[PDB]
């Protein structure tokens, strides 16, 4: 245990109505971790868009942001459905350890345009 997840592509470009899909990769046998997908706020805080597994009790949840676990179990698709003008910005994913409770490690940040 354990390294931060990877997050690709570094630069993702779309324009209106498209689907913008990132990939978060986290090699683990969990050993319970959970994953978060964040976008950087205007005040440079990490705003949580979605989790894996799904954070169903998140208030103000936006269903346009979806996180899907791929069959290899290590790769996750983090996707904005029908991406919009203001969705452009900085994105990243994080792995959170449930046992030390606190522990998060973040990926490198990416850009969506």
């Amino acid at each position, epitope marked *: 245990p354990w390294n931060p997840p990877t997050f690709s592509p570094a630069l993702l470009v779309v324009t209106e109505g498209d689907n913008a899909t990132f990939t978060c990769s986290f090699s683990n046998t969990s050993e*319970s971790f959970v994953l978060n997908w964040y976008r950087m706020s205007p005040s440079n805080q990490t705003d949580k868009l979605a989790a894996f597994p799904e954070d169903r*009790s998140q208030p*103000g949840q936006d269903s346009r942001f979806r996180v899907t676990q791929l069959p290899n179990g290590r790769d996750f698709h983090m996707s904005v459905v029908r991406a919009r003008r203001n969705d452009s910005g900085t994105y990243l994913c994080g792995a*959170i350890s449930l046992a030390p409770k606190a522990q998060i490690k973040e990926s490198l940040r990416a850009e969506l345009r």
Partner: antibody
Amino acid sequence: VQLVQSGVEVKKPGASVKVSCKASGYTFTNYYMYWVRQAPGQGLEWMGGINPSNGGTNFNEKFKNRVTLTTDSSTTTAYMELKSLQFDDTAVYYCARRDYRFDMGFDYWGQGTTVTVSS
Amino acid sequence: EIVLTQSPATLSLSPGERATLSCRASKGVSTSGYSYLHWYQQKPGQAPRLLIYLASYLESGVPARFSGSGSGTDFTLTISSLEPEDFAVYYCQHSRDLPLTFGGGTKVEIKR
């Protein structure tokens, strides 16, 4: 780390009540806030939650028509307004925080606000 | 809604004795090996305190004699040896979906 709630309320039926829950900057950037109540002699009932980062809310459907949830970022205070009060709204009301990353339980509760509703 | 049934309503035990509390859900509260179930303690005139989160994780600050177990519909909270401070009411709570709900509570009282 503190959640400090406003004091005792005594209200007529049909009236409104607004309960406050003062937190911290850390709480507001790292937690969601939830409201829970407890009638005298009874257990706990969830009412709703709010995301201090965008004002988004969720609700127990039972309370949706009469509860308004808001936050004041500048004073890092959460508010619960219950309108059109009924006799069985008499309860202790709690605010509680939950890690914004994942539900790792309500790890800190305010001291509670007693609300009595009666003609 | 998912409804949580706690039993027994009252446990009568002496200090030093093991306490085992049960919580049963009307539908499964587990997904992907995660169980969205937590346990709280409440004393008269006081707000609840978190003991156990996600079925089996000990909240930091909480003594090692408290432990949680279970998955799906069947959960237990165990106190390996009761201290005088542990006589209180205990609740379980789920967040598998909305609405969030709590069990009816189990009171642990002193046997005499």
